[PDB]
Design an enzyme around this catalytic site. Sequence first.
Site, PDB file in Angstrom:
ATOM      1  N   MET A 105       0.825  -1.205   0.000  1.00  0.00           N
ATOM      2  CA  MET A 105       0.000   0.000   0.000  1.00  0.00           C
ATOM      3  C   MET A 105       0.860   1.256   0.000  1.00  0.00           C
ATOM      4  SD  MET A 105      -2.993  -0.882   2.659  1.00  0.00           S
ATOM      5  CE  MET A 105      -4.494  -1.712   2.155  1.00  0.00           C
ATOM      6  N   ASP A 106       1.854   1.303   0.876  1.00  0.00           N
ATOM      7  CA  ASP A 106       2.685   2.490   0.935  1.00  0.00           C
ATOM      8  C   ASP A 106       3.375   2.742  -0.402  1.00  0.00           C
ATOM      9  OD1 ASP A 106       3.768   4.693   2.585  1.00  0.00           O
ATOM     10  OD2 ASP A 106       5.673   3.696   2.142  1.00  0.00           O
ATOM     11  N   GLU A 107       3.869   1.677  -1.036  1.00  0.00           N
ATOM     12  CA  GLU A 107       4.530   1.817  -2.332  1.00  0.00           C
ATOM     13  C   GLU A 107       3.557   2.298  -3.411  1.00  0.00           C
ATOM     14  OE1 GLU A 107       7.421   2.124  -3.354  1.00  0.00           O
ATOM     15  OE2 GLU A 107       7.247   1.811  -5.527  1.00  0.00           O
ATOM     16  N   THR A 122       5.818   9.884   2.988  1.00  0.00           N
ATOM     17  CA  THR A 122       4.592   9.413   3.622  1.00  0.00           C
ATOM     18  C   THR A 122       4.430  10.109   4.965  1.00  0.00           C
ATOM     19  OG1 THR A 122       5.002   7.170   2.717  1.00  0.00           O
ATOM     20  CG2 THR A 122       3.265   7.411   4.393  1.00  0.00           C
TER      21      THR A 122
END
Lengths: 186, 186
Positions: A105-107, A122
């Site tokens: 998700m972060d990527e 982020t």
Amino acid sequence: LKDYALPNASWCSDMLSLYQEFLEKTKSSGWIKLPSFKSNRDHIRGLKLPDCRIFTRCIQVEGQGFEYVIFFQPTQKKSVCLFQPGSYLEGPPGFAHGGSLAAMMDETFSKTAFLAGEGLFTLSLNIRFKNLIPVDSLVVMDVEVDKIEDQKLYMSCIAHSRDQQTVYAKSSGVFLQLQLEEESPQ
Amino acid sequence: LKDYALPNASWCSDMLSLYQEFLEKTKSSGWIKLPSFKSNRDHIRGLKLPDCRIFTRCIQVEGQGFEYVIFFQPTQKKSVCLFQPGSYLEGPPGFAHGGSLAAMMDETFSKTAFLAGEGLFTLSLNIRFKNLIPVDSLVVMDVEVDKIEDQKLYMSCIAHSRDQQTVYAKSSGVFLQLQLEEESPQ
């Protein structure tokens, strides 16, 4: 060089099928397939920060780590990540670690934020998990930019099975817009 | 078998120093060092769920992936993870991916929740990032169980440099308590 976001023998049937559907969307619907290189180095032009691999490509042996491809829709500021976690990403036996979904998700948020509004850092990631992901299965991750305000991009994500009968998680992310800096010639 | 949560040549000076300090705490302060095996398999007795590696040990080559050790204090329901992200965990060049910190947090929360109250399923993970982590540096992650209520364990985490002059992130996690099930003999 090598684009890891292309099919290989490890991709499950559903992942391949959905990939083909999105490839078609790149032909007639304005979508674009993002490349995925072994690291971010030399792949973010002009970046100034305060042997190596990008985390989601830390495993290069096909099928064992993160198998994924991200498609981006520039007009709509949305993306879809097709994600198949392999057996080196396990949490409880037979299922993906929650941290692997968080990482994916972060990527995806990161790449989407960068293309949509030059976000990168982020600021926050908030994830609500609903179901375990079986190893080697397809997770479809729909990401959208909800707003851009105060030099921040706000995004939301839903991760689900292709048939949508299983939701794995919902999340939100907030990313800082990179500063543009006008420097003198050196 | 192999406990990966033991020193190797890749650990930075600060990580080794703090490790020794916590080892001493296991002698006279009730702390315990958790082992870290190549996977969770056969390491969660009696677990019933709906070649392989646990995600945070997906890389076995020393120094390149997650280097870490978790210490747990049973009386206080607190833990400390010493985490050194290697060069395969990169985000922007020279720094750890935010998703690697998210993963390490989820894993530390998971082990802490399990030992403190048999929590396991991550219900939610909320992370506020403050600073990038330089690759190969020590991140000290202080985790505490704040409360146990309604079959859920609530935990908080702060990730910081050893000297505490840099905070990398703060997070909260909520974990579901495993159900105990009384089955008949088969």
